[PDB]
Amino acid sequence: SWEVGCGAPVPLVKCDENSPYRTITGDCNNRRSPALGAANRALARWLPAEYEDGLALPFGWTQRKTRNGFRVPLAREVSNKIVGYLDEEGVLDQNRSLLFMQWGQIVDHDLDFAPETELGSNEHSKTQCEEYCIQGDNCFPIMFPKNDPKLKTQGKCMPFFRAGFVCPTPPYQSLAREQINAVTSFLDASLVYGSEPSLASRLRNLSSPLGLMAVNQEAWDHGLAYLPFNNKKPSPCEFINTTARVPCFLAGDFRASEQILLATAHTLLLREHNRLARELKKLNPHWNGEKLYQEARKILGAFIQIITFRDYLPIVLGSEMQKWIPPYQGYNNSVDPRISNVFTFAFRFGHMEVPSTVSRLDENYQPWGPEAELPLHTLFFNTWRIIKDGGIDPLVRGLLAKKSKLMNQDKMVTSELRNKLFQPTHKIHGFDLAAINLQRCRDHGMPGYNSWRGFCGLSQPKTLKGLQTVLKNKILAKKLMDLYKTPDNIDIWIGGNAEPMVERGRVGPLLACLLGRQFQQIRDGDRFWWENPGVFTEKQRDSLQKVSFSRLICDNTHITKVPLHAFQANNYPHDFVDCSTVDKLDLSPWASREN
Ligand code: HEM
Ligand SMILES: *[C@@H]1O[C@H](CO)[C@@H](O[C@@H]2O[C@H](CO)[C@@H](O)[C@H](O)[C@H]2NC(C)=O)[C@H](O)[C@H]1NC(C)=O
Ligand SMILES: *[C@@H]1O[C@H](CO)[C@@H](O)[C@H](O)[C@H]1NC(C)=O
Ligand SMILES: *[C@@H]1O[C@H](CO)[C@@H](O)[C@H](O)[C@H]1NC(C)=O
Ligand SMILES: *[C@@H]1O[C@H](CO)[C@@H](O)[C@H](O)[C@H]1NC(C)=O
Ligand SMILES: [Ca+2]
Ligand SMILES: [Cl-]
DSSP states (O other): OOOOOOOOSOOOOOOOSSOOSOOSSOTTSSSSSTTTTOSSEEOBOSSOOOOSSSSSOOTTSSTTOOBTTBOOOOHHHHIIIIIOOSOOTTOEEEEEEHHHHHHHHHHHHHHOOOOBOOSOTTSSHHHHHHHHOOOBTTBOOEEOOTTOHHHHHHOSEEOOBOBOBSSOSSOOSSSOOOBEEOSOSSOSOHHHHOSSHHHHHHHBOOSSTTOOBOOOSSOOBTTBOOOOBOOOSSOHHHHTOTTTOOOOBOOSSGGGGSBHHHHHHHHHHHHHHHHHHHHHHHHOTTOOHHHHHHHHHHHHHHHHHHIIIIIIHHHHHGGGHHHHSOSOOOOOTTSOOSOBTTHHHHGGGGGGGOOSEEEOBOTTSSBOSTTOEEEGGGGBTOOHHHHTTTOSHHHHHHHHHSEEEOOOSSSOSOHHHHTTEEOSSSOOEEEOHHHHHHHHHHHTTOOBHHHHHHHTTOOOOOSHHHHHHHHTOHHHHHHHHHHHSSTTTSBHHHHHHHSOOOTTSSSOHHHHHHHHHHHHHHHHTOTTOTTSTTSSOHHHHHHHTTOOHHHHHHHHSSOOEEOSSTTSOOOTTTTOEEGGGSOOOOOGGGOOOOO
16 A cells, blocks of 8 residues: 655656557557556566665665675676676677677667766766766766776776666655656657657658658768767767767667667668658658658558567577567557566677677678778767768678677677777776676666576576576686675676577577566557557558568668578678569558548
8 A cells, every 4th residue: 555656757648549650758559557668757667676775775885785695796896707808709699690789779779768867967966976986876986896907097986877767866755766768668669760759850851741850961871861960069979089070960869879880770760761751752642741750650660670579589589489479469458568677687688799890891792991890999979980981881781791799608798898988978988888787787776686587487596506507607607606695696687698598599598588578568568569450451561571671771771782681690692682682662552542
């Protein structure tokens, strides 16, 4: 008999019995509970939060407060001892293209964003944390251990600001702190169109009644569109080359410029909307602007959903795919479609799949120019390498011909991310995404590794010998026991990712359960799922059946040689075919021949 959810932010709640189109915010998707899966609401709690104080303080905040009678190891020490490796040789995935890593980050970006609290935008609050490393309020610095090389070149800490939470921005009464999902839980292309009405209108071309998305006016890719620039400072994309002065891009999601291949993928998606808008005009010259936007938006939403669930999830989950995601049996309005706090950590498995280098290939799939291959760390917030060095085609070839990094228990996160991560505001290519992932776990009050094994109906090792058996690795198990003293204390991010990969998949059994459940819930609980009776026509649905990533590239770049199966390892010229031969999306069924 406890009171039900403080939602003082987001009072707006007006819904519509007609609507054949998703809202931008994802409101009104669920008729009975219409805020479920909407942006700027709490992440769902599959299990109760676990803070040191039971409310808000993360484990590792107070020196003398143990977790189950043991101090928690520093994020950065766990990073250094477990996550790091030197040798990039033999680390590549012989059966996953780099497009595999890249699609993951896109889907993640559609589903969840828990952005850091905004009580320090052009304030001397950010600097307190950076310079002086002093813990307090929303500053929760990543302190270096004794023998850390970063001590010698970077100071005592790496800065870290706690994530936004609902009813902000000082804590409340006697409910655990709940972090905001700032995008739509629905796989709805929010990353392209935005999750706020504000950003959604900005991105749109409201000059012509063609329902087009705004494209770059300052620069073109052999006639093909770039995303608009984000004319705001400080721009991190300007910071990394003040001679190029190429701003970050403006997309439906904030993080589109974080690295050059995400920006690339955002560019294909935008172009595809525009191509769809133009072809719907041809076939329906009567349709006004809004109609064209919405009818293109909804097709691209289907596209993202089909590629994710037909092509991507099966080669993530492998043998566990059908245990968790059986054939669609239609909309179930009883399902919770909200993204869970734990999913936003479970989906970070993607971090082990990022390789140390990126390549540009010519029309013969050969090194484009003399610096064709670049270290990943020089491509954080790097847009000028696209604008002033060959557009997205050389990079979209590298996404086809190059391989993802394979998860390895001995080689977890490349030093490009683990030591050389660039963050906006901060000046240096010197951060640790592994350490960030671990502090964030604690920041979100995540239950430990065994709570989540429990949740998924899996054994809970309590001994070294127990952990060895589960991880199938005596040395990794040893290092974790030395750090965490009990498997109960292991942060789910590292515990989940340390498990050996399921047959035909790229995650362990724990992550397969957590990912599997979340993707089942976003499908079965989405009123606007593409294959859900009444959303498309029977004829339209047969047209959608035919989409491929290959087609997406043929239609939206100057590439003519692609593989049939974009996510497998594919070598040129053998596994490559003429676009001429690749199933089109026939849009005839969108023609409103009748009235
Ligand atoms: C070069 C590639 C990538 C970079 C530079 C990158 C960087 C980042 C950064 C900086 C964060 C925020 C960390 C924090 O404040 O807690 C993050 C979060 C995340 N990343 Fe990545 N990432 C990359 C690739 C991927 C991939 C391939 C996936 C999945 C397949 C992925 C999934 C996630 C998820 C799920 C989150 C949490 C998002 C949220 O709800 O806030 N990332 N990434
Ligand atoms: C900043 O960007 C500029 C280009 O905008 C880079 O310089 C092209 O770079 C190389 C020379 O190193 C040549 O291929 C071109 O002739 C350059 N053009 C110009 C106008 O310089 C420069 O290297 C970048 N700097 C960094 C630190 O990345
Ligand atoms: C590669 O993965 C595919 C699924 O993408 C699978 O059907 C096949 O067994 C694998 N091929 C090789 C060469 O191992
Ligand atoms: C809007 O569309 C018109 C017609 O295609 C075009 O001329 C104009 O540049 C577009 N504006 C933007 C900002 O994309
Ligand atoms: C709908 O969802 C609930 C809870 O997930 C489940 O118990 C119920 O049986 C479902 N019904 C169908 C037809 O899937
Ligand atoms: Ca979404
Ligand atoms: Cl290189």
